[PDB]
């Protein structure tokens, strides 16, 4: 639409929210493949930050291609490598969600603030396969990666 | 014009089979050859920002791909190889890079020279 | 529909067409392989059937249904499941084994009680004798002692045709000493047991190799039909797309012209 | 004249072929099979099969295991899990495979695992014996 | 020719909705297996 | 009752080891057709 | 279009004809999923009339939902329960068709007038699966339900 | 807030799998949600008291209809609700210890 | 009306669906009738020549025939009824109807014609 | 689109150039099945012209359906007459290609101007089977059929 379309040229960072993502229950409903920043550059944020960001985006982009195939083939028919790409991309999607302090009214769940280095570490670990053994639900609506490990422990007891 | 001509062909062949890589097992070795070449040449098209290349440097890395010196190498290792191979040829084979520039072509003597350099570099690649 | 709805739908079905086309070709190269592998396996499996088809053998019953886990192969699974329930209602204590998860999906609501064991991971790599062995071992050393049994599967005939068949398993080591098997009488129980076991593996191997050829050919056809149907939809949607595209330009422009004239 | 069928799951060697005599390596001894042979069932050991041809002499095959069925009619089906001509086997490998199994024999501390070693020694033993 | 990954989900069409349910089914069965395995690792 | 049968093993299992050994003794020319045969794809379904 | 769009609000009952329904040869080409009435209310037509009407619409809508899947994947991907919804829905579609007295010049069939009680009972029986044994084409261009059974016996 | 709190959670999880509408074990994933969807159906001109709404939602949410034919639930709710209004007005009172035990007392005997 | 009053119906039914039961035989009739309705440019037919052609198809004589051959049948059949059976065509024209004497005559023409050519 | 739609009304023929035909190595890169002409009528071009052209059109259409069986299945999955129609159709598309006078400066081959009468009788002889004993490459990039006979003698 001409109004928001013309607005993009005026910004250094864009956080693009998406209805499809909100309807999946992911808040904040940020599109990871349509939000940008002029400082997303390894000479500015450092190579570790940049490499993890681009690795997350790569898995989520590869995930899109796989969803088209799944729509016909189903999940069980995928190769073990692809199922692993799907498993991890799904954990990543959910670890990108976060309880906001200001949203403690909708859910009743306490807001969380995650330091940068903690954010980088968590996604690094998911992509490296360090949590392939936990259910994706453990990564939904938490703060740092340690709350996911702990959420998986609560859910195991309730099982 | 030498190396690009063949790379254009092989990417165009690969682009027709590219879907079969992501899901295709019992496929003939002929289409397996196109997929292996394609995924590797594709990696050579990747480039970081703010680092434009001298024509001779481009053709040296493209030569490596189109002559088949990457065919036995892992796709994840192609960029590592490209960077390493370029550092090697720049550091110690300026004379070969200079002539290819000046003449604007790869002579038979130049091609024989470049043939050996890639072969010897590749042989001691993964330390 | 809106221009945006049409465009999104067109893009989806184009993707579906490409994938079903690719999977038709996958199934075609897989089918060609299965049909080559079926050639020696038919000689082998029919040779293992020679004993019972040269002697009148009679007599807890065991039904083994054979298909795969994979969808989009026409009536491959419904066929076998239809004969499984059909023969089950005709028999008089029945226990059921299903090889291929799609067997269990169709039968579970009515025959859940009768299920001994299920096997999965069928239809991804061409079956081997190892796979026949794995099923074989998880039946003998499981706990169920069957008097008679039968195996139900799709026997390959051509690219487009297959027949749902039933083979008997008299593997009851007690029935191997009866009326017509009286001429096979010098063998001690030890070797008859070894024979009985091996022939149990052979008949399951035989069903596995026939079923897979039928399944791959049927997968090829289903994907071929899917991509032909998708192409037809694509053609029709593209026409609607272009009509709608032109009509939006026309509509927009008439609005701006009205806005200009009114000033 | 006996109609001989000789196959593995993956390979056919004879399909209802007229042969004079088949020698078979069996669990308890060795059986020589002629056209007028009494009906019998039996299972195999690793060893050689000798097929005596209608015309002249013989051909040789190595069989892993499986079954042999001789019927009322002169039909005989030999069904091996693995069957190869000795032209296909490497001596260096089977000899190397022998010492590998001979090494596991003097170390295993479980009954079921012990038998799985002895079977492999026995198999490699016959392979080397043939090669 | 033109890039189009994820178009099936993007349409909210039958095929789109079906694939979403199919993924969910798969990962709920995985979660059951993983929570039990986590229970038995608990002691 | 052979040494392996007393151990609780079947002729299926005996035959599988025998078959594997004959394959493991092929040379790199027929060894290529180890892969396409001798698989372990099929898996049991519990709970 | 603004003209028909503005007209709906002026009506108590609407009968919407559909070209697509006509091209299935179904006459009158009434869209069962786009035609409404103010008096379609259990307190007015009775709970029996109402339940059957809604039952028909539900099975036609359920069938409509399967068609994007059928369109591509065909019938073999459907369960045996969904194969019956498709069967019962195709016959219900066809039984809603009717020969008109005024259309004998085009049809070559005698026009039919069907009492309300026979329309209710007829569809109520198809919904119940009481005629799951008849071919689809026996339900095409007939009056009351007894004429479908008769048309089914005309062919072997 | 109690009973609709669990229904909101239970229907959101359902909506994620709803599209399955053969099925293997995807049917335990469908059970509750399908029943709850039937319980949100409502006729015209009969708006309901909050306690009446709670009482019917409860029956579904506590899984007491999980084996009843989903097509019957419409018939069930009306009949069940009429009986609670007429004879169990005391139960609709103060609007979950005594109430919890007393609702299952009716629901069991009713679901004959 | 006596011929087209059944051909009209058998073709909208056929279009919709574009071993099996009556559904498949709808397709078998539909293909023959379609071929029967083919006509070259500048090839006028009088109404009586038209009904005789339609008759052959609509009564089920070409139902045993192969669809490819329908065109050749029509051209030879029409030119034959034009050559000697001008009496029949005259009767159908003037009476504006297929009388019982025309109906039985035509039935004998098609049956005897159907068998007797080189293929 | 109104622009091509309006032009199309004035056209008496279409000549369709295609990349696919060019990628096969055929020049001129004319699509023999998509190109059309309004004067392709027996009364205008002659009976002999129309028959050959419609015969050449059909065998290329056969070759298209026959090539959709080889890719899926295999070459020896077709009958005895099937391979005959393939062999002729491969030579037909090669006798469609032509060296141009205006392309002599680049490729290094002499260009040919072929009369209509030699085009007709040349193509008619391929369909008749009179050149089944000749290799395909003799028909490729030549003028009259006299060159198709002579080129085979020069080769090998």
Selection from H59, C195, J83, A63 nearest residue E20 by Cα: A63
H42 annotated to bind ligand: yes
CA-to-CA distance for D84 and H40, rounded, in angstroms?
Answer: 70
**Domain assignment of residue B4, given as a range:** 1-127
CA-to-CA distance for I59 and I106, rounded, in angstroms?
Answer: 11
Q: Are C84 and F5 in contact (CB under 8 A)?
A: no
CA-to-CA distance for I69 and I76, rounded, in angstroms?
Answer: 11
Q: Are strands D47-53 and D76-80 parallel, antiparallel or unpaired?
A: unpaired
J129: left (phi over 0), alpha (psi -120 to 50) or beta: left
Q: Are H17 and E25 in contact (CB under 8 A)?
A: yes
The reply to whether omega before G65 is within 30° of 0 (cis) is no
Side-chain-side CA neighbours of residue G8 (13 Å): 9
Residues 6+ apart with CB under 8 A from D68: D24, D26, D31, D33, D40, D41, D42, D43, D44, D76, D77, D78, D79
Residues 6+ apart with CB under 8 A from A86: A63, A66, A70, A75, A78, E23
Q: What residues of chain E lie within 8 A of the CB of G72, using their CB? A: 15
**CB–CB of H16 and E20 under 8 A?**
yes
Residues 6+ apart with CB under 8 A from E32: A159
Q: Are I17 and I27 in contact (CB under 8 A)?
A: yes
Q: Tell me if there are at least 3 CB pairs under 8 Å linking chains D and E.
A: no
Determine the distance in angstroms separating the CA of G30 from the nearest CA of chain E, rounded to an integer.
Answer: 26
Residues 6+ apart with CB under 8 A from G60: G32, G33, G89, G92, G93
Report CA dihedral (C198, C199, C201, C203) to the nearest 10 degrees.
170
What tokens does H37 get? 């969807």
Residues of A within an 8 Å Cβ radius of E: 20, 61, 64-65, 67-68, 70-72, 74-76, 86-87, 90, 133-137, 152-153, 155-157, 159
What tokens does E36 get? 């039990």
Selection from B116, B106, B48 nearest residue B82 by Cα: B48
Determine the distance in angstroms separating the CA of A41 from the nearest CA of chain B, rounded to an integer.
Answer: 10
Number of domains in chain E: 1
The set of long-range contacts for B110-117, using a CB threshold of 8 Å and a minimum separation of 24, is: B114/B60, B114/B63, B115/B67, B117/B88, B117/B89, B117/B93
Q: What residues of chain C lie within 8 A of the CB of G72, using their CB? A: 13, 16, 20, 226, 229-230, 233
CA-to-CA distance for J143 and J96, rounded, in angstroms?
Answer: 9
Neighboring chains of B (3 or more beta-carbon pairs < 8 A): A, C
State the residue for tokens 């999104």: C8
Search chain A and give the residue with CA nearest C120: A76
Shared domain check, D128 and D96: yes
Q: What CATH number is attached to the domain comprising D122? A: 1.20.5.440
Facing C194 at nearest CB: one of D7, D27, D71: D27
Q: What CATH number is attached to the domain comprising F1? A: 1.10.1620.20
Q: How many residues does chain E have?
A: 43
CA-to-CA distance for D120 and D96, rounded, in angstroms?
Answer: 12
CA-to-CA distance for C210 and I9, rounded, in angstroms?
Answer: 46
Side-chain-side CA neighbours of residue C31 (13 Å): 24
Search chain H and give the residue with CA nearest C104: H24
Q: What residues of chain C lie within 8 A of the CB of A73, using their CB? A: 19, 23, 71-72
CA-to-CA distance for H89 and A4, rounded, in angstroms?
Answer: 57
**CB–CB of G41 and H23 under 8 A?**
no
Kindly give the interhelix angle for A80-95 and A47-73, rounded to the nearest 10 degrees: 120
Q: Per-residue b/e over C51-66, b at no fewer than 16 CB within 10 Å?
A: bbeebebeeebbbbbb
The DSSP symbol for A65 reads H
Residues 6+ apart with CB under 8 A from A90: A63, A136, E23, E27
Please indicate the experimental technique that yielded this structure: X-ray
**CA distance to I27, I28, I65, per residue, from I61 (Å):** 16, 12, 8
- Pure H helices in J71-99: 80-94
State the residue for tokens 């049917």: H27
**CB–CB of D127 and F8 under 8 A?**
no
**CB–CB of H22 and G41 under 8 A?**
no
Q: What CATH number is attached to the domain comprising E30? A: 1.20.5.500
- Pure H helices in chain A: 2-7, 19-23, 42-45, 47-73, 80-95, 116-128, 145-157
Beta bridge partners of D19: D2, D53
**CB–CB of C32 and J1 under 8 A?**
no
Q: Tell me whether D97 touches chain F (CB under 8 Å).
A: yes
Determine the distance in angstroms separating the CA of C243 from the nearest CA of chain J, rounded to an integer.
Answer: 9
Q: Which residues 4-43 of chain E have a CB within 8 Å of chain C?
A: 4, 7-8, 10-11, 13, 15-16
Spacing of C-alpha C54 from chain mean position: 30
Q: Are C17 and C230 in contact (CB under 8 A)?
A: yes
**CA distance to A132, A154, E39, J122, J142, per residue, from A150 (Å):** 15, 7, 13, 83, 79
**CB–CB of A72 and C16 under 8 A?**
yes
Determine the distance in angstroms separating the CA of C73 from the nearest CA of chain F, rounded to an integer.
Answer: 19
CA-to-CA distance for G35 and G19, rounded, in angstroms?
Answer: 14
Determine the distance in angstroms separating the CA of F47 from the nearest CA of chain D, rounded to an integer.
Answer: 27
Annotated binding site of B: 47, 49
Q: Per-residue b/e over G82-119, b at no fewer than 16 CB within 10 Å?
A: beebbebbbbbbbbbbbbeeeeeeebeeeeeeeeeeeb
Shared domain check, D35 and D49: yes
Residues 6+ apart with CB under 8 A from J116: J49
Neighboring chains of A (3 or more beta-carbon pairs < 8 A): B, C, E
Other Cβ atoms less than 10 A from the Cβ of A116: the count is 9
Search chain E and give the residue with CA nearest G73: E15
CA-to-CA distance for G135 and G112, rounded, in angstroms?
Answer: 21
Number of domains in chain H: 1
Q: What CATH number is attached to the domain comprising I24? A: 1.20.150.20
Shared domain check, D115 and D54: no
CA-to-CA distance for A7 and D89, rounded, in angstroms?
Answer: 74
Spacing of C-alpha J125 from chain mean position: 13
Residues 6+ apart with CB under 8 A from G8: G14
Facing C75 at nearest CB: one of G72, G73, G76: G76
What tokens does D45 get? 């050991």
Q: What residues of chain C lie within 8 A of the CB of F5, using their CB? A: 190
Q: What residues of chain I lie within 8 A of the CB of G155, using their CB? A: 22
Q: Is the dihedral of CA H74, H75, H78, H84 positive or negative?
A: negative
Burial degree of J4 (CB within 10 A; 0-12, 13-18, 19+): exposed
Neighboring chains of D (3 or more beta-carbon pairs < 8 A): C, F
Q: Tell me whether C101 touches chain F (CB under 8 Å).
A: yes
**Domain assignment of residue J46, given as a range:** 40-156
CA-to-CA distance for H25 and A39, rounded, in angstroms?
Answer: 48
Residue of C24, C29, C37 to mutate when probing chain B, most B C-beta within 10 A:
C29
Q: Tell me if there are at least 3 CB pairs under 8 Å linking chains D and I.
A: no
Facing C22 at nearest CB: one of B23, B25, B26: B23
Q: Tell me whether C134 touches chain B (CB under 8 Å).
A: no
The reply to whether omega before J103 is within 30° of 0 (cis) is no
Spacing of C-alpha B75 from chain mean position: 12
CA-to-CA distance for A55 and B2, rounded, in angstroms?
Answer: 35
Beta bridge partners of F43: C120
Selection from C68, C48, C50, C62 nearest residue C127 by Cα: C68
Side-chain-side CA neighbours of residue D65 (13 Å): 29
Phi and psi dihedrals of D22, rounded to 5?
A: -125, 120
CA-to-CA distance for B47 and G89, rounded, in angstroms?
Answer: 59
Please calculate the CA angle J40-J46-J47 and round it to the nearest 5 degrees: 95
Facing B19 at nearest CB: one of C18, C30, C33: C18
Q: Which residues 148-207 of chain C have a CB within 8 Å of chain H?
A: none
Selection from H8, H81, H1 nearest residue H48 by Cα: H81
Q: Tell me whether C255 touches chain F (CB under 8 Å).
A: no
Determine the distance in angstroms separating the CA of F42 from the nearest CA of chain D, rounded to an integer.
Answer: 17
**Domain assignment of residue E25, given as a range:** 1-43
CA-to-CA distance for H15 and H33, rounded, in angstroms?
Answer: 8
């Amino acid at each position: 639409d001409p109004a928001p379309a013309t607005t993009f040229a005026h910004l250094d960072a864009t956080t693009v929210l998406s209805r499809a993502i909100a309807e999946l229950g992911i808040y904040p409903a940020v599109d990871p493949l349509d939000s940008t920043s002029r400082i997303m550059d390894p000479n500015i944020v450092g190579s570790e930050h940049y490499d993890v960001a681009r690795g997350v985006q790569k898995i989520l982009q590869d995930y899109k291609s796989l969803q088209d195939i799944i729509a016909i083939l189903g999940m069980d028919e995928l190769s073990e490598e692809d199922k692993l790409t799907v498993s991890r991309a799904r954990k990543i999607q959910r670890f990108l969600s976060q309880p906001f302090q200001v949203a403690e009214v909708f859910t009743g769940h306490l807001g969380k603030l995650v330091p940068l280095k903690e954010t980088i570490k968590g996604f690094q670990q998911i992509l490296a396969g360090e949590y392939d053994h936990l259910p994706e639900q453990a990564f939904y609506m938490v703060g740092p990666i340690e709350e996911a490990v702990a959420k998986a422990d609560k859910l195991a007891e309730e099982h | 014009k030498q190396v690009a001509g063949t790379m254009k062909l092989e990417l165009a062949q690969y682009r027709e089979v590219a879907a079969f890589a992501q899901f295709g097992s019992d496929l003939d070795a002929a289409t397996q050859q196109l997929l292996s070449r394609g995924v590797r040449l594709t990696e050579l098209l990747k480039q970081g920002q703010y680092s434009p290349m001298a024509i001779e440097e481009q053709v040296a890395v493209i030569y490596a791909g189109v002559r088949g010196y990457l065919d036995k190498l892992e796709p994840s290792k192609i960029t590592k190889f490209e960077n390493a191979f370029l550092s090697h040829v720049i550091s110690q084979h300026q004379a070969l890079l200079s002539k290819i520039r000046t003449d604007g072509k790869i002579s038979e003597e130049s091609d024989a020279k470049l043939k050996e350099i890639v072969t010897n570099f590749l042989a001691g690649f993964e330390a | 529909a809106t221009l945006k709805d049409i465009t999104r739908r067109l893009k989806s079905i184009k993707n579906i067409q490409k994938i079903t086309k690719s999977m038709k070709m996958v199934a075609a190269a897989k089918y060609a392989r299965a049909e080559r592998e079926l050639k020696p396996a038919r000689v082998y499996g029919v040779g293992s059937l020679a004993l019972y088809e040269k002697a009148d053998i009679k007599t807890k019953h065991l039904i083994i249904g054979v298909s795969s886990d994979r969808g989009l192969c026409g009536a491959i699974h419904s066929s076998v499941a239809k004969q499984m329930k059909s023969e089950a209602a005709n028999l008089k204590e029945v226990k059921i084994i299903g090889v291929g998860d799609k067997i269990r999906s169709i039968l579970h609501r009515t025959h859940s009680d009768q299920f001994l064991v299920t096997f999965k991971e069928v239809g991804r790599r061409p079956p081997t004798f190892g796979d026949a062995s794995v099923i074989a071992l998880e039946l003998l050393n499981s706990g169920y002692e069957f008097d008679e049994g039968s195996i139900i599967f799709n026997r390959f005939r051509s690219v487009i045709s297959y027949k749902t068949e039933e083979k008997p398993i008299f593997s009851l080591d007690t029935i191997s000493s009866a009326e017509s098997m009286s001429i096979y009488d010098d063998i001690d129980a030890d070797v008859l047991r070894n024979y009985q076991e091996y022939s149990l593996a052979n008949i399951i191997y035989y069903s596995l190799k026939e079923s897979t050829t039928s399944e791959q050919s049927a997968r090829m056809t289903a994907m071929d039909n899917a991509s032909k149907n998708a192409s037809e939809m694509i053609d029709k949607l593209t026409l609607t797309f272009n009509r709608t595209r032109q009509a939006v330009i026309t509509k927009e422009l008439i609005e701006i012209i009205s806005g200009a004239a009114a000033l | 004249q006996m109609s001989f069928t000789f196959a593995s799951p993956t390979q056919v060697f004879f399909n209802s072929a007229n042969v004079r005599q088949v020698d078979v390596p069996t669990q308890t001894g060795a059986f020589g099979i002629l056209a007028a042979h009494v009906p019998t069932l039996q299972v195999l050991r690793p060893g050689l099969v000798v097929v005596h041809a209608e015309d002249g002499t013989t051909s040789k095959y190595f069989v892993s295991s499986g079954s042999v069925t001789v019927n009322a009619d002169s039909s005989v089906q030999l069904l091996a899990e693995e069957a190869v001509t000795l032209d296909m086997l490497d001596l260096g490998a089977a000899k190397a495979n022998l010492e590998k199994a001979q090494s596991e024999l003097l170390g295993a501390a479980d009954e079921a695992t012990r038998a799985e070693i002895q079977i492999r020694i026995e198999a490699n033993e016959a392979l080397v014996k043939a090669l | 020719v033109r890039s189009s990954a994820g178009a099936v989900r993007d349409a909210g069409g039958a095929f789109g909705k079906r694939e979403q349910a199919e993924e969910e089914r798969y990962f709920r069965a995985r979660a059951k297996e993983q929570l039990a395995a986590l229970k038995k690792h608990h002691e | 009752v052979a040494y392996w049968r007393q151990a609780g093993l079947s002729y299926i299992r005996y035959s599988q080891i025998c078959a594997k050994a004959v394959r493991d003794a092929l040379k790199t020319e027929f060894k290529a057709n180890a892969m396409k045969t001798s698989g372990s794809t099929i898996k049991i379904v519990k709970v």
